[PDB]
Amino acid sequence: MQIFVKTLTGKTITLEVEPSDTIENAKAKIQDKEGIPPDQQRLIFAGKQLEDGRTLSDYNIQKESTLHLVLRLRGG
């Protein structure tokens, strides 16, 4: 399986995940691919602003799903 991640530049990235690993791995993967830190990277797939303790994985993300990559706080 695999998931798609869309950025603010349009370029879509392909991320591979499994129903056993946490979205944490996906975030780290994108960081090593784009060089963006986890602090300036936010994966959205249903909005949910400031959750009480829920995670993106709790949404049971499906395959071939479009993920929204948001950038919080820029350096340049």
DSSP 65: P
Method for structure elucidation: NMR
What's the CA gap between 7 and 51, in Å, rounded?
22
**Domain boundaries, given as residue ranges, for the chain:** 1-76
Q: Starting at the edge strand that comes first in sequence, how are the strands of the sheet with 12-15 ordered?
A: 12-15, 3-6, 66-70, 42-44
What's the CA gap between 10 and 12, in Å, rounded?
6
- 2, 29 in Cβ contact below 8 A? no
What's the CA gap between 24 and 56, in Å, rounded?
10
First to last CA, the chain: 35
Tokens read off for 30: 């994108």
- 69, 30 in Cβ contact below 8 A? yes
Q: What would you report as the CA-atom Rg of the chain, rounded to the nearest whole angstrom?
A: 12
Tokens read off for 26: 């996906």
Tokens read off for 3: 């998931």
